[PDB]
PDB file of C-alpha atoms in Angstrom:
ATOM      1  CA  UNK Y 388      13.008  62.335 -55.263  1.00  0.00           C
ATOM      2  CA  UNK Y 389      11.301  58.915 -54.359  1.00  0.00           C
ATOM      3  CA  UNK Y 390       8.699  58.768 -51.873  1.00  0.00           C
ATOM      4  CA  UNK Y 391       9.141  57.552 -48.692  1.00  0.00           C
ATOM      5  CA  UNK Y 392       6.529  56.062 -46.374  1.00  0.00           C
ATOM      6  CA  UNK Y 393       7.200  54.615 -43.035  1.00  0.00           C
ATOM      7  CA  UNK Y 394       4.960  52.197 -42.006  1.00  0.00           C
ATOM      8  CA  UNK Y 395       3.791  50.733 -38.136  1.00  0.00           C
ATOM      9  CA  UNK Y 396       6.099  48.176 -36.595  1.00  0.00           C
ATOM     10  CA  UNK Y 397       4.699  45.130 -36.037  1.00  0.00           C
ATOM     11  CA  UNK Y 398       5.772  41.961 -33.815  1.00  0.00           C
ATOM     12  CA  UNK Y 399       4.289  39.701 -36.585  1.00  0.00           C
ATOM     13  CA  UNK Y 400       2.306  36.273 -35.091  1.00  0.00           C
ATOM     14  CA  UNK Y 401       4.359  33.713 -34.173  1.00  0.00           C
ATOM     15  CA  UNK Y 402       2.876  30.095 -34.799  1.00  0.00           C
ATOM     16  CA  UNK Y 403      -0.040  29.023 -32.069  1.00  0.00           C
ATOM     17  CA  UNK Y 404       0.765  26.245 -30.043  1.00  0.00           C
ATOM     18  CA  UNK Y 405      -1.741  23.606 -28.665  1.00  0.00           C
ATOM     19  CA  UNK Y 406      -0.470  24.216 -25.021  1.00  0.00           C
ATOM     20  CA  UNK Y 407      -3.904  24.253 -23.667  1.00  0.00           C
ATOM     21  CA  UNK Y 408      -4.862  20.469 -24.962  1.00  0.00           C
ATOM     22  CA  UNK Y 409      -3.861  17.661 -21.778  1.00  0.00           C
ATOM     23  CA  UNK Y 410      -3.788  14.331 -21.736  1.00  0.00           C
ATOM     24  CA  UNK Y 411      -4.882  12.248 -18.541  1.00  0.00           C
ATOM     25  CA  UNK Y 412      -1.695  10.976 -16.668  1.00  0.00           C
ATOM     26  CA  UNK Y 413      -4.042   7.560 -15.569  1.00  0.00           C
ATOM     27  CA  UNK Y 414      -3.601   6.326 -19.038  1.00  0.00           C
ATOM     28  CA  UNK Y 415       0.104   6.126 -18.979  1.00  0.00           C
ATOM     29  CA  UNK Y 416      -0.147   3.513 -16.061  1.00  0.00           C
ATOM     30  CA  UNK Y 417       0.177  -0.713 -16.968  1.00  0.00           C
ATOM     31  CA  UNK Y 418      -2.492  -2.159 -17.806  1.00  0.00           C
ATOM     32  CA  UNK Y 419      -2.532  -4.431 -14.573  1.00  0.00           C
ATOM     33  CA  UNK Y 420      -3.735  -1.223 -12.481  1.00  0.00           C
ATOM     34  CA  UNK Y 421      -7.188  -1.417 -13.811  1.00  0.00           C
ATOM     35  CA  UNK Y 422      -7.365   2.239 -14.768  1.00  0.00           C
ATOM     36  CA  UNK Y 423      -7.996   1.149 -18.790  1.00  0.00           C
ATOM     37  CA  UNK Y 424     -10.902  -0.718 -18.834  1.00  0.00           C
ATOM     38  CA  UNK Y 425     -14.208   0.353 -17.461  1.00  0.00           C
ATOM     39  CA  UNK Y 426     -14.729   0.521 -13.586  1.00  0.00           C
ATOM     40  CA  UNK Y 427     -16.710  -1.643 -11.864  1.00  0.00           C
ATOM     41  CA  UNK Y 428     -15.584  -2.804  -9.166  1.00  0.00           C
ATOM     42  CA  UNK Y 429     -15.127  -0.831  -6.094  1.00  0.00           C
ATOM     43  CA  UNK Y 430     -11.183  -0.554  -6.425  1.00  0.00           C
ATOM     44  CA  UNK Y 431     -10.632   0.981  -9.408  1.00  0.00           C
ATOM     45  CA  UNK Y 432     -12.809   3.432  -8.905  1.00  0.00           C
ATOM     46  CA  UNK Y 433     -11.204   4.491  -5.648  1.00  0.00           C
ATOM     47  CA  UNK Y 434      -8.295   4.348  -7.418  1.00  0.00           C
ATOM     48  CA  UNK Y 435      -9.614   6.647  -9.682  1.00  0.00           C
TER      49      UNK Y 435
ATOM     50  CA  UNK L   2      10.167 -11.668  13.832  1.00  0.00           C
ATOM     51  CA  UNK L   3       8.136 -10.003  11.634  1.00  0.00           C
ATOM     52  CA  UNK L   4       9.608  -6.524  12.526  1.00  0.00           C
ATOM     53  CA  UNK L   5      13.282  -7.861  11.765  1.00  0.00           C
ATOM     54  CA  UNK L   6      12.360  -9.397   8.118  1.00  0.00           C
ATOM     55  CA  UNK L   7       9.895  -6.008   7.493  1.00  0.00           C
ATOM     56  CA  UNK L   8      13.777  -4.055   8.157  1.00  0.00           C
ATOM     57  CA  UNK L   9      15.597  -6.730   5.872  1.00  0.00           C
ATOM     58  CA  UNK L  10      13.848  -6.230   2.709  1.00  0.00           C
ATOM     59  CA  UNK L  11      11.506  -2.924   3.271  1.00  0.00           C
ATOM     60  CA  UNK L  12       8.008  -1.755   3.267  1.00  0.00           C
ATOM     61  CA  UNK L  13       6.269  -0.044   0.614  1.00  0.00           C
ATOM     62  CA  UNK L  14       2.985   0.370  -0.967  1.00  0.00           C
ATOM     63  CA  UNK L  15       0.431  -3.200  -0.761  1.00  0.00           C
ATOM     64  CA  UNK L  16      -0.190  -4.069  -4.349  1.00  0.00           C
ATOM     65  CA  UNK L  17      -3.197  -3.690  -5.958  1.00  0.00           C
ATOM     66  CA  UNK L  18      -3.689  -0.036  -4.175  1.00  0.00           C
ATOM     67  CA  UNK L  19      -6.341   0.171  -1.127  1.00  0.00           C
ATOM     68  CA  UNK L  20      -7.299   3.176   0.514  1.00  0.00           C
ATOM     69  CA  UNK L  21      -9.058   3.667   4.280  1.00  0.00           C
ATOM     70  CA  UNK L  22     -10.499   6.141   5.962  1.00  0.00           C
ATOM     71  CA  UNK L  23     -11.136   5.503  10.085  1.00  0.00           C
ATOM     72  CA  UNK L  24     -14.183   6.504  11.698  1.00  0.00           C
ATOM     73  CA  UNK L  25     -14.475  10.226  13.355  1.00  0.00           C
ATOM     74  CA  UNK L  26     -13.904  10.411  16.886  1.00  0.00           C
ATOM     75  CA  UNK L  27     -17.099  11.772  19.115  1.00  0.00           C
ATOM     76  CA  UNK L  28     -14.251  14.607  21.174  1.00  0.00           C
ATOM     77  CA  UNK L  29     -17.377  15.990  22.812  1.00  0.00           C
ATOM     78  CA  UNK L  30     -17.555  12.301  25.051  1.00  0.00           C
ATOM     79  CA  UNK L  31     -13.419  12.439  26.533  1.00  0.00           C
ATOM     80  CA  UNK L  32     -13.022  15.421  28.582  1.00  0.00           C
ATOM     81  CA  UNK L  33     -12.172  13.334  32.014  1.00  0.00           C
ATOM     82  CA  UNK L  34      -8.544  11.622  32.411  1.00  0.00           C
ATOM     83  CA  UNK L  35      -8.681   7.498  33.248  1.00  0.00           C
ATOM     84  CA  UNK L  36      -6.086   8.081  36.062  1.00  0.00           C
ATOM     85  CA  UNK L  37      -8.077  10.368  37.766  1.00  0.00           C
ATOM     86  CA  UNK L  38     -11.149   8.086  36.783  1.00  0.00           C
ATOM     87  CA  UNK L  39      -9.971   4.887  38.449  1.00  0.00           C
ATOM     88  CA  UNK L  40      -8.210   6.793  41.633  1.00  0.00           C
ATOM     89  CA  UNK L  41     -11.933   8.230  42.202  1.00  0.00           C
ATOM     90  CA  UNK L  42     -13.449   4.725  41.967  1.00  0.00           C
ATOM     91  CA  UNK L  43     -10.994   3.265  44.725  1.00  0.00           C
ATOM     92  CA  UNK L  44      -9.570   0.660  42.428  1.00  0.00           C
ATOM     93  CA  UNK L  45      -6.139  -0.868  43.324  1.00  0.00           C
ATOM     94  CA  UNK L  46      -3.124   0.996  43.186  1.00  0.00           C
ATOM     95  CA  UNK L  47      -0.833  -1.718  41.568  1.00  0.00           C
ATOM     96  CA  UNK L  48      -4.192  -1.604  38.989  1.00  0.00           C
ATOM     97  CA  UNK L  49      -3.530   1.465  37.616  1.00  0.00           C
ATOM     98  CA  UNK L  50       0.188   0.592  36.700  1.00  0.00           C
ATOM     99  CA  UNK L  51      -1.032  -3.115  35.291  1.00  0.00           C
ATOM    100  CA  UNK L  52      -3.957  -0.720  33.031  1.00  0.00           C
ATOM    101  CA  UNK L  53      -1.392   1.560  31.979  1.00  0.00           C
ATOM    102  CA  UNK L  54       0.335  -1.756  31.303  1.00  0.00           C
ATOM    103  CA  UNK L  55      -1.909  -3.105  29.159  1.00  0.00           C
ATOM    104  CA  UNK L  56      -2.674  -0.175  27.021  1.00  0.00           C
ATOM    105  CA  UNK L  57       0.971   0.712  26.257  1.00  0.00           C
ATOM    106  CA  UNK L  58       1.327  -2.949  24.924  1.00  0.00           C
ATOM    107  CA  UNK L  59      -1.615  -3.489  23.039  1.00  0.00           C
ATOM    108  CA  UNK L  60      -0.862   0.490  21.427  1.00  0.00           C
ATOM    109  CA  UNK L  61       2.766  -0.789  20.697  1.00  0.00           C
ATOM    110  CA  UNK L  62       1.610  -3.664  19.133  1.00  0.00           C
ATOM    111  CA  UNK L  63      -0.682  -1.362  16.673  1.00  0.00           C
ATOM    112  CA  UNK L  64       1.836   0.681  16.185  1.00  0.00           C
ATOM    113  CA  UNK L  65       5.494   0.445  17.627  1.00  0.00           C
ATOM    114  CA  UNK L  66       6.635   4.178  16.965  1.00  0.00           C
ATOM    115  CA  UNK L  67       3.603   5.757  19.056  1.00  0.00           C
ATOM    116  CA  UNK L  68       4.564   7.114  22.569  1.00  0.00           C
ATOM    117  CA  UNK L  69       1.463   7.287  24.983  1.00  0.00           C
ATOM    118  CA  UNK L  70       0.775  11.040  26.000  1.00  0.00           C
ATOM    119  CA  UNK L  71      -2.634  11.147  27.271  1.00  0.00           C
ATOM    120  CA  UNK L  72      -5.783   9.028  27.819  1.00  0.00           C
ATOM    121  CA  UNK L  73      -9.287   9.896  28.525  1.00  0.00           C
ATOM    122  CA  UNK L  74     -13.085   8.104  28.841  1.00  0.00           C
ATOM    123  CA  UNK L  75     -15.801   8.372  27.673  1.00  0.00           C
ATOM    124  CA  UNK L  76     -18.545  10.250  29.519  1.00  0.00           C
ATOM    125  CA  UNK L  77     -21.188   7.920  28.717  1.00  0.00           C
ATOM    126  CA  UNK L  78     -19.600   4.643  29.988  1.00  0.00           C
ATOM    127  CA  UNK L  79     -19.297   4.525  33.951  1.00  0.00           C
ATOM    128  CA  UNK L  80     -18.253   1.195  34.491  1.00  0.00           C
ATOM    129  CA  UNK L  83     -16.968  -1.772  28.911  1.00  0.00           C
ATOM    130  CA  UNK L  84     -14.909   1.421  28.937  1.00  0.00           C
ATOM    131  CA  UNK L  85     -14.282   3.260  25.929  1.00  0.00           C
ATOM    132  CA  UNK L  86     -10.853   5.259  25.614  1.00  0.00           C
ATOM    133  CA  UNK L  87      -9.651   7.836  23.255  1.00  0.00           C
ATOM    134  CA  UNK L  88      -5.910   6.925  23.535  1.00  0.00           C
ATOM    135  CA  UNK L  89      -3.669  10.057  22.247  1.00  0.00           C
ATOM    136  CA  UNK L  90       0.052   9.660  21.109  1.00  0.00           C
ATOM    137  CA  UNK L  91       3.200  11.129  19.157  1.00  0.00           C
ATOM    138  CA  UNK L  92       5.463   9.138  16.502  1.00  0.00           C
ATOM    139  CA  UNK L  93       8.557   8.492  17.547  1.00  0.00           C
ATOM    140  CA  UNK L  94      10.484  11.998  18.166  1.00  0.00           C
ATOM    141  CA  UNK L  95       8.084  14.036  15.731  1.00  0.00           C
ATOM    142  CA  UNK L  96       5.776  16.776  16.660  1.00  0.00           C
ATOM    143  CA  UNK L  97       2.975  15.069  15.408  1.00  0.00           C
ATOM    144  CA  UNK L  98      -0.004  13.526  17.691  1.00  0.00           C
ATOM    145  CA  UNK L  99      -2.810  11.177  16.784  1.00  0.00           C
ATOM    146  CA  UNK L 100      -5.765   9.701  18.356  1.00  0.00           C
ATOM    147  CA  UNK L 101      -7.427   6.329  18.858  1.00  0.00           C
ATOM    148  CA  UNK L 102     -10.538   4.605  20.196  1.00  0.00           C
ATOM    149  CA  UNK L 103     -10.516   1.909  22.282  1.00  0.00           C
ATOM    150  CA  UNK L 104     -11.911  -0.382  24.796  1.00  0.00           C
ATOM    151  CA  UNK L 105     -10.926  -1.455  28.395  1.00  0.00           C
ATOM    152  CA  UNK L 106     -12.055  -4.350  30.074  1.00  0.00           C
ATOM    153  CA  UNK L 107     -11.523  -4.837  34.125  1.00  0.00           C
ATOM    154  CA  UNK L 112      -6.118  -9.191  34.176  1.00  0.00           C
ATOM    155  CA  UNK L 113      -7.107  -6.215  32.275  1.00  0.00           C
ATOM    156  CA  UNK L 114      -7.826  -6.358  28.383  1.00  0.00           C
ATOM    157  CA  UNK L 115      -7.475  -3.514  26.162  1.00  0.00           C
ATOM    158  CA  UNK L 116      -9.248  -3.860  22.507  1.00  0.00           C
ATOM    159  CA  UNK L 117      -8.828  -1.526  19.508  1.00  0.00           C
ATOM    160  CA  UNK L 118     -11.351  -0.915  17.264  1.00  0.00           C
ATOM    161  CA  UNK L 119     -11.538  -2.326  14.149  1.00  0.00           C
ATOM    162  CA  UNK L 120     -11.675   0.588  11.778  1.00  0.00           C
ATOM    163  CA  UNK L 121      -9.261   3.520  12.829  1.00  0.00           C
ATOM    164  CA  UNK L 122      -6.880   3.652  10.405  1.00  0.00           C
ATOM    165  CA  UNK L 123      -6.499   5.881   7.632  1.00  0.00           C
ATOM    166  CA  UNK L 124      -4.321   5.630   4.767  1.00  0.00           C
ATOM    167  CA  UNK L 125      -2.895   3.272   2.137  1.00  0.00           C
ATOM    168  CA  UNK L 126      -2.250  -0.577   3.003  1.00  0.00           C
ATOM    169  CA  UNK L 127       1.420  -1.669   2.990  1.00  0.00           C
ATOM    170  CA  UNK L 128       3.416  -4.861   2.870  1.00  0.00           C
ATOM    171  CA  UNK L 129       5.878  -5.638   4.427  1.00  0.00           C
ATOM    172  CA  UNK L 130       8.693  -7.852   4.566  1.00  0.00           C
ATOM    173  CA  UNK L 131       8.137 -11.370   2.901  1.00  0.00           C
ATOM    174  CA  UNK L 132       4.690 -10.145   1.335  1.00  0.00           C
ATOM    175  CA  UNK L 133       6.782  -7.043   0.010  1.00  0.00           C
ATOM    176  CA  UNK L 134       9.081  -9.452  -2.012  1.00  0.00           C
ATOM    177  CA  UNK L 135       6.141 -11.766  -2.615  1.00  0.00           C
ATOM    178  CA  UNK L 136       4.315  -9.281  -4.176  1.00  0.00           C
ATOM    179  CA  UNK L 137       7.162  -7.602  -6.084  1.00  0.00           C
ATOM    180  CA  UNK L 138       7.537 -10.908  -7.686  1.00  0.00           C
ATOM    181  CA  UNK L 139       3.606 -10.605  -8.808  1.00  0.00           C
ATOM    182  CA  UNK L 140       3.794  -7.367 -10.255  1.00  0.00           C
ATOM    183  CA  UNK L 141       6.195  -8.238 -12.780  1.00  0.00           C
ATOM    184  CA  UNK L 142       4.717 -11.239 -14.097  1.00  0.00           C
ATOM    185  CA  UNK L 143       1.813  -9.085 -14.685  1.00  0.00           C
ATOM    186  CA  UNK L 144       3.506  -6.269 -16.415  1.00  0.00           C
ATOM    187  CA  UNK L 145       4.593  -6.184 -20.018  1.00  0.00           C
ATOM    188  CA  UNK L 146       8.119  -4.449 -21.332  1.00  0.00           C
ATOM    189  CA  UNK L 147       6.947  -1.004 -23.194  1.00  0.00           C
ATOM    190  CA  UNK L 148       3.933  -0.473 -20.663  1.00  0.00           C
ATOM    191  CA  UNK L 149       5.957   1.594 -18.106  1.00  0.00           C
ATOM    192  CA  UNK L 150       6.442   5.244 -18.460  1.00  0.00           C
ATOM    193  CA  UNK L 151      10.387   6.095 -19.168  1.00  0.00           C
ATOM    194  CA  UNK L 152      10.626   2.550 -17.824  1.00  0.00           C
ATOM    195  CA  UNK L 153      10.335   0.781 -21.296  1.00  0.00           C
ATOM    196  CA  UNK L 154      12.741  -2.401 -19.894  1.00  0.00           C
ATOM    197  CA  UNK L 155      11.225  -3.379 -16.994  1.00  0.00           C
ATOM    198  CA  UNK L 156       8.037  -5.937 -17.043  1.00  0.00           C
ATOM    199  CA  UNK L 157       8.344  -9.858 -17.579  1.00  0.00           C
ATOM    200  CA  UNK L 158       7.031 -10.400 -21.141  1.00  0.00           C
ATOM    201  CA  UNK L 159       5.261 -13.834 -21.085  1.00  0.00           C
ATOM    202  CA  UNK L 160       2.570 -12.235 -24.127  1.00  0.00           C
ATOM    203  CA  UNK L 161       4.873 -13.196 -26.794  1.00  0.00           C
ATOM    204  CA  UNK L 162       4.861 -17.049 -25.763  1.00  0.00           C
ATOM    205  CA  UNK L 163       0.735 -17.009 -26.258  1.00  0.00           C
ATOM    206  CA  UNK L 164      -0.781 -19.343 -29.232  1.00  0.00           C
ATOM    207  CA  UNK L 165       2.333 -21.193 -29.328  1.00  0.00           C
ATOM    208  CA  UNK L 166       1.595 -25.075 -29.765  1.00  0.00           C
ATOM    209  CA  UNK L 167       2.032 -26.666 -26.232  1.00  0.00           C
ATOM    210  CA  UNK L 168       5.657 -28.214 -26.757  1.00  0.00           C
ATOM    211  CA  UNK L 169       8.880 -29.179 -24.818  1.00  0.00           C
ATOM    212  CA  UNK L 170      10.162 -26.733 -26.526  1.00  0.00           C
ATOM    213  CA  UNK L 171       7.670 -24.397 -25.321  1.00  0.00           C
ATOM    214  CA  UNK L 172       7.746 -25.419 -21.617  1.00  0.00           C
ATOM    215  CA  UNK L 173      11.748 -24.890 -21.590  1.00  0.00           C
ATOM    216  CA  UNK L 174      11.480 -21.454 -23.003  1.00  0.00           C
ATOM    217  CA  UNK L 175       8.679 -20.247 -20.660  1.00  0.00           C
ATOM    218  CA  UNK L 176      10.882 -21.726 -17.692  1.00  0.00           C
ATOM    219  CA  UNK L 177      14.107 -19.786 -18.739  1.00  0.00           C
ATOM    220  CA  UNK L 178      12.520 -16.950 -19.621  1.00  0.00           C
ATOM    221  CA  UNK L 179      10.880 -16.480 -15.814  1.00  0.00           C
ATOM    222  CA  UNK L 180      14.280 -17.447 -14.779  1.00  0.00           C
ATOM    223  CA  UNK L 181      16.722 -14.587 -16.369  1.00  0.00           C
ATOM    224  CA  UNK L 182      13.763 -11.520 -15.968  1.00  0.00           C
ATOM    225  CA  UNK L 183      13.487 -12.272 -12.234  1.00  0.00           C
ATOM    226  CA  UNK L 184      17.467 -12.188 -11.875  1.00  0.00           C
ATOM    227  CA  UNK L 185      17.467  -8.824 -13.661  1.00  0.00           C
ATOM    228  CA  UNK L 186      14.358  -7.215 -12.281  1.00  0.00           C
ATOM    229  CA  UNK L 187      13.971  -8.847  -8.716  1.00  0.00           C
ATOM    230  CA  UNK L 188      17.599  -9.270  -6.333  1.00  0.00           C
ATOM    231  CA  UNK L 189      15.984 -10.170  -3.011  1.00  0.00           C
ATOM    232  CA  UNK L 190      14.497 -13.032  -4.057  1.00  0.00           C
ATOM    233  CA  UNK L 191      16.212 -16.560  -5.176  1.00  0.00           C
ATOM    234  CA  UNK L 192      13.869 -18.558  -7.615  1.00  0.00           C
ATOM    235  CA  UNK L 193      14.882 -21.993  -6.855  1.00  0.00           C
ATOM    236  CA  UNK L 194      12.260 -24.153  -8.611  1.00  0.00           C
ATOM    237  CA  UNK L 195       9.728 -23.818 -11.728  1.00  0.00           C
ATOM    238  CA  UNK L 196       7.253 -26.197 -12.570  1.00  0.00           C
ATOM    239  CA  UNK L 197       5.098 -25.482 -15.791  1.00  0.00           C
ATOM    240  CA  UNK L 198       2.211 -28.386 -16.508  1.00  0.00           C
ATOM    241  CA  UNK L 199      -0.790 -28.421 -18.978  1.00  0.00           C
ATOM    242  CA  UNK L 200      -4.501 -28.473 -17.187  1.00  0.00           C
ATOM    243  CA  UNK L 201      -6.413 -31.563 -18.105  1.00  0.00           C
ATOM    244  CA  UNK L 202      -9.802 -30.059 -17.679  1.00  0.00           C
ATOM    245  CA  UNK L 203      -8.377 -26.842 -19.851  1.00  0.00           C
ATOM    246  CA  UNK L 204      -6.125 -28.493 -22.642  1.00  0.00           C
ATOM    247  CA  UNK L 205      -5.054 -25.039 -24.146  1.00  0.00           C
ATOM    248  CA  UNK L 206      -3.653 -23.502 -20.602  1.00  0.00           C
ATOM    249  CA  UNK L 207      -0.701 -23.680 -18.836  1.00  0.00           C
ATOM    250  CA  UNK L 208       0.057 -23.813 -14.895  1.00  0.00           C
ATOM    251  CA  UNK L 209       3.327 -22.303 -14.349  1.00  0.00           C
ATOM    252  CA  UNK L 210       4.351 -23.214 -10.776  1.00  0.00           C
ATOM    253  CA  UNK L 211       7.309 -20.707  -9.128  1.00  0.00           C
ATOM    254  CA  UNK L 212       8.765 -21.564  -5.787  1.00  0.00           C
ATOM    255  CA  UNK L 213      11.072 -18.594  -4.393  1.00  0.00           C
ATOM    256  CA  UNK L 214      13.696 -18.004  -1.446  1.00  0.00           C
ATOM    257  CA  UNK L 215      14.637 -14.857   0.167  1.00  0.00           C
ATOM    258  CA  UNK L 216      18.227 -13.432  -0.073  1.00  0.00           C
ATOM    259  CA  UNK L 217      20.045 -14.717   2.321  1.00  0.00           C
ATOM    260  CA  UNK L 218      17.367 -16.643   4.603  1.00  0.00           C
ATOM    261  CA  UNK L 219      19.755 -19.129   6.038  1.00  0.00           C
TER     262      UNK L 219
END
């Protein structure tokens, strides 16, 4: 008679997504807004 | 006027962004009504109703939607009069205050630096500035907006030509149709500086929609 052997079950991994990484939503604004270049003046950085 | 062209073509946000904050408001100084104030000082009946007068109008002309619910002075002035002037917006539930100063016809002044908020344009500087933002904006810089912008970039390090000026002056003319419908462009002048041989003045000259 062959052997049987039962095993745990197992929910194997699924693949690790980079959820946690963000990107700042400033950058997607034109370039006109002053929010891509360093601040210096007192606008941008209030607008900041 | 002003009011009737800010309702023809809108108000929105003042372009680049500016932000305020007014200064606080000493409460612990208004605790004593300015009716009450200038019956106890034996000033002229048909004076109150010429004060209240004057600070309803010069409030309406700060802002139109307030509606005058209470006024109060300040403790330390007793005849120059500082006022904490209180008000709703329109039919709202919400009240505001605002300093001020009386002067005895009667002049009411508002201080400088109340306001708190965002600056807005209005009317003709609304258009105006629409106008501005889209000569400064390129196509492909706006999120899910990839269309809109002028696009003047790819006409840089061309050699100064006729050919150049004419496609610089039709360009401006079709992106302002599409992107811009309350304003009319009705002239466009583009000249070469003398003192700056390798830049171009572009001169635009707008109507509004409709104006006569």
């Amino acid at each position: 008679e062959p052997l049987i052997e039962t095993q745990p079950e197992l929910l194997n991994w699924g693949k690790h997504r980079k959820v946690l990484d963000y990107y700042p939503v400033s950058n997607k604004l034109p370039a006109c807004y002053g929010l891509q270049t360093y601040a210096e003046t007192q606008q941008q950085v209030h607008l900041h | 006027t002003n009011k009737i062209l800010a309702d023809i073509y809108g108000r929105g946000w003042a372009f680049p962004p500016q932000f305020f904050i007014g200064e606080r408001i000493p409460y612990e100084d208004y605790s004593s009504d300015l009716n009450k104030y200038l019956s106890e000082k034996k000033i002229e009946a048909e004076q109150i109703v010429k004060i209240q007068a004057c600070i309803k109008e010069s409030v309406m002309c700060y802002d139109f939607h307030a509606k005058i619910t209470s006024t109060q002075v300040s403790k330390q002035t007793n005849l120059p009069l500082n006022i904490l002037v209180t008000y709703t917006l329109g039919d709202s539930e919400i009240s505001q205050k605002i300093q001020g100063v009386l002067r005895v016809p009667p002049q009411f002044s508002i201080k400088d630096n109340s306001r708190t908020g965002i600056a807005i344009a209005e009317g003709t500087q609304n258009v105006l500035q629409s106008i501005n933002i889209l000569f400064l904006t390129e196509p492909g810089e706006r999120i899910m907006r990839e269309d809109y912008g002028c696009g003047l970039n790819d006409y840089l390090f061309a050699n100064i030509s006729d050919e150049l000026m004419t496609d610089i002056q039709t360009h401006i003319e079709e992106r302002v149709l599409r992107y811009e419908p309350r304003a009319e462009i009705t002239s466009i002048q583009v000249n070469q500086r003398t003192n700056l041989p390798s830049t171009l003045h572009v001169q635009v000259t707008y109507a509004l929609r409709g104006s006569d």
